[PDB]
């Protein structure tokens, strides 16, 4: 098998705890502490090969660690998350890109726009700014919702997806 | 509901007044987190303390099957760890991974819980569901101060 790095960043209460969780276990929390910062793994067949991830989940920037750092320097894929209700969030996600292409030295990292909690009526953000935003940065764009898990797998897949068109 | 909020803001004389006034030790919310874990995992030593004596489980787990140990080894609270070893915790404890808490301390580089762990009596070459170790943890990220205390 293969090893690739999946590591998802974004602002707080948006979802990435109850996104990784979904994948790993499908089941979704309904609450979780918002300081938590793990890694896990799954073993998972995309199109006609069996490979293995392991995505870190991470949770701020309020102190330094060292397994952060390492994963930021080394992690290929990234999962730039934000919620569709929250537009603080949606502004965001310039700083973050640009942070991890600092890290990066910013060549080619393969990145992926993703749209959480789209179950919910009410909204801030629409589909025609958050897809803009992603054709602008040359990336895909995926809504996702997990309590429905509608893209949840999707936006691992595709990240996946452009991790192996970088290598190629 | 109140004790794990609570527990997780680190108040004392909070936790006393609902304990004393009948709040249970053992809840736990959707995940399986019980005060003993937010305890352990933001730094709390006299809540822990409390708790422990309170009649509270020490090696109660969550839906990644976590224990206390897992979250003080994985934040760096050696005070924490001692004090959980002191009270019979399992050293040698695995979650749906079957990470031992030596695998949590020995990736995030924490040197000292390290040492306290195996001077607890832990296995050093314990594999996980993936055929990995510590030593192969700590290969990985190319530690130097890791790879001696192990091989030692
Ligand atoms: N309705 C809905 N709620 C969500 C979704 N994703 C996350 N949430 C809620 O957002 C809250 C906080 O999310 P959290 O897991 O802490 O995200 P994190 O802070 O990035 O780790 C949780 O209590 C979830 O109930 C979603 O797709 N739909
Ligand atoms: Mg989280």
Known sequence: ????????????????????????????????????????????????????????????????????????????????????????????????????????????????????????????????????????????FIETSAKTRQGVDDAFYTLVREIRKHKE | KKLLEAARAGQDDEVAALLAKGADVNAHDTFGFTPLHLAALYGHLEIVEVLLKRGADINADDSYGRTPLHLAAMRGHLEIVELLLRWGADVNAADEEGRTPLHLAAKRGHLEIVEVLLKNGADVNAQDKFGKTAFDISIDNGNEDLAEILQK
Do not use: W
């Not at chain 1, 929390?29 to 896990?40: M, R, W």
């Not at chain 1, 991470?58 to 929250?86: K, P």
């Not at chain 1, 973050?96 to 009526?121: A, F, H, T, W």
């Open chain 1, 1 to 140: 098998m293969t090893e690739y790095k999946l590591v998802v960043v974004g602002a707080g209460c948006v979802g990435k705890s109850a996104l990784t969780i979904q994948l790993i276990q499908n089941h979704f929390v309904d609450e979780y502490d918002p300081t938590i910062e793990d890694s896990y793994r799954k073993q998972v067949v995309i199109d006609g090969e069996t490979s293995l991830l392991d995505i870190l989940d991470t949770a701020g920037q309020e102190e330094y660690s060292a397994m952060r750092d390492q994963y930021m320097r080394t992690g290929e894929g990234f999962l730039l998350v934000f919620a569709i209700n929250n537009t603080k969030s949606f502004e965001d996600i310039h700083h973050y890109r640009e942070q991890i292409k600092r890290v990066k030295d910013s060549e080619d990292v393969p990145m992926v726009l993703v749209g959480n909690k789209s179950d919910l009526p009410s909204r801030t953000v629409d589909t025609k700014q958050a897809q803009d935003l992603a054709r602008s940065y040359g990336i895909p």
